[PDB]
Design a protein around this ligand. Structure first.
Ligand code: ANP
Ligand code: ANP
Lengths: 395, 322
């Protein structure tokens, strides 16, 4: 048994999980938020207890110190030397990183190098790596990149139809994200079916606050809906996904919107929130819709249609479909969303069993369906801990 | 019996005897680029100053009286789209206050070729689930179910959807703010990027013309080869969306300068579609026969020459000489 810590550092936050491996049992989890701001709060939960404290937390350096002190001060660990490894979520690995990587000092520089491509995320992700190496010098660390799973896309899937130099010189191409999630659920599906992933054509829908769809054929990602950044693809909580690109120059001429305002339009005011006028939260929009808000109902319907259109593209590209996976906050819990997405797919041999779908059973396809339809809880931290075991503790 | 079809730094004309269909101009039917939301069909002209009110949305084409007449709108066929197909997931007010939504174009072409397909098969068009591919310098796909357009790939303007001669089609919208921030692009520079510099031209760096790109790829140019693959993938991804939406497919139509003539393009688009019952017959595809599916195929695949002028004439004949 090994004790592996999975870390996810944000602009103002620090999420962590401590796992018992290789079984994957959750020892503790928690969140430090509002770092460097007032209302800074530290929440820490075990299997059995919860602790919560509002207190000043200056920077991420102070956030990490409080985490480590609490692990022993709450009796979770007898000592910090019991930690066998740390995995860190990194937003963007560009083309450099095709897999999770052992953290030496010029994987950190490489991650810093890519900062240009994930400005709000990669710098702080690297800061986390730095702090833990400083405060946990003897513990090996692994970086797990949200883009790495998608590096098997072929050129005709990642090249945008712009002038060649926009890729050759500026790096503009599809990257895709949620890589760690799509990887985790597709491998989990294969173990539940008792067949290897290489035998199945799989479409994976990660539907949360951010949403993306991924086509997995022969064990490899061959397409995915997010692109150059996590804004694009299907409709999301506050992100519009794909729209007519010519709308943007129109809006600049018309409303004088800056680049920062265009990006805020696309990332923070669109999606469920922008269409419903109600909320970014699926449950809130659905509640409003059943009370007769027609914009809210339209929002939910458009949400399902955008996902259907993307699934349809990927089934075409693979030449058929053997399994469809739902995951994320919406995909795991909304029988209604899943039903709307899966309706009228007899041309694929795909239909749902209503009773199974209503209780979110693992498999929800109908008795005579040719396509397996799975509801799988995603567990990205578990997937990170397994990357730590694989690359830092190879025995 | 004597119908003229007008399309106006140009002025193209055509006069046909119906119904067999056999200043600068020193019944008639007039091509109009954008009909917005108020024209669901061709319209006897009288309409003219609401046409010009729509110049806001088609400034380069609509404004361009000199000449019974009927206006035919390239957007009109697509006004049967439901809101899930035309509403972008932007803040509501961008549709409700500024009219931003999908309109779609090539409506006359898609309408003409889909009706021609049904006539050749001897069934009502509403009996079929059809995907229509207008592939020329401009490119677009249209899904016709129950005899009505239910989706189409061009959006707010003819710039978007699939990859074309010089137009990019759809791309990650986040690229644009990034290009402004990192290269200071102006709103008009963005437009000519998306409209004039991309597509087959931009990727290949050889030509906007499919044939030119084709020749350069067979001589070993690798950007050219990649441009032709991407071109095909964009169309396939869109066809796949519309098959999903319609719940299946009865027929696939190819038209326009590329679709009517390029066996290569059609073969690459139809590759590995046995899960649909769609496969091509090499011999028929090679000579662009009217039907090119294999004889075991369940999906019909047709090559139909689009005839927008003759479709326009049938519209004035219907609404001006009933
Ligand atoms: N029982 C439920 N029924 C419907 N929607 C739910 C339910 N539980 C949660 N959600 C929605 O799921 C979404 C939350 O997704 P979640 O996967 O938890 O996002 P996240 O953890 O912030 N990161 P990400 O998944 O990448 O967006 C929100 O829209 C919630 O309203
Ligand atoms: N025999 C051919 N083989 C392949 N491509 C062809 C052939 N003949 C014409 N083309 C293509 O036809 C394209 C333009 O087709 P065409 O339908 O005439 O466009 P258009 O007349 O300008 N109007 P539009 O339909 O909007 O594109 C050119 O880019 C050529 O690549």
């Amino acid at each position: 048994t090994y004790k592996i810590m999975a870390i996810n550092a944000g602009s103002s936050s620090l999420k962590f999980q401590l796992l018992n491996m290789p079984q994957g049992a959750l020892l503790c989890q928690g969140l430090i938020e509002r770092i460097g701001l007032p209302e800074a709060r530290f929440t820490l939960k075990t299997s059995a207890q919860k602790w919560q404290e509002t207190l000043p937390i200056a920077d991420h350096h102070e956030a990490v110190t409080l985490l480590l002190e609490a692990l022993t001060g709450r009796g979770i660990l007898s000592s910090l030397q019991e930690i066998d490894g740390v995995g860190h979520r990194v937003a963007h690995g560009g083309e450099r990183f095709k897999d999770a990587a052992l953290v030496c000092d010029d994987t950190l520089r490489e991650i810093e190098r890519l900062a240009e491509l994930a400005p709000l995320h990669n710098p702080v992700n690297a800061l986390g790596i730095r702090l833990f190496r400083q405060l946990l010098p003897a513990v090996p660390a692994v970086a797990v990149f949200d883009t790495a799973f998608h590096q098997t896309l072929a050129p005709e899937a990642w090249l945008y139809p712009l002038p060649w130099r926009y890729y050759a010189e500026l790096g503009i191409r599809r990257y895709g994200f949620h890589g760690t999630s799509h990887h985790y659920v597709s491998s989990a599906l294969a173990e539940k079916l008792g067949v290897p992933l290489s035998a199945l054509r799989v479409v994976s829908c990660h539907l949360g606050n951010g949403c993306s769809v991924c086509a997995i054929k022969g064990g490899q990602s061959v397409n995915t809906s997010m692109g150059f950044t996590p804004q694009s693809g299907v409709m999301m909580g506050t992100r519009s996904g794909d729209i007519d690109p010519s709308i943007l120059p129109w809006l600049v001429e018309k409303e004088g919107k800056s680049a920062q305002q265009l990006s805020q339009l696309l990332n923070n005011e669109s999606g469920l929130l922008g269409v419903s006028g109600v909320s970014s939260d699926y449950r809130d929009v659905e509640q409003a819709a059943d009370a007769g808000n027609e914009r809210a109902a339209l929002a939910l319907s458009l949400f399902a249609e955008r996902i259907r259109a993307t699934i349809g593209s990927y089934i075409m590209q693979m030449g058929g479909l053997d399994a469809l996976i739902f995951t994320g906050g919406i995909g795991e819990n909304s029988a209604r969303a899943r039903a709307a997405i899966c309706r009228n797919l007899h041309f694929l041999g795909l239909a749902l069993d209503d009773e199974k779908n209503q209780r979110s059973a693992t498999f929800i396809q109908a008795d005579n369906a040719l396509v397996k339809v799975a509801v799988i809880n995603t567990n990205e931290e578990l997937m990170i801990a397994r990357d730590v075991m694989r690359l830092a503790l190879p025995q």
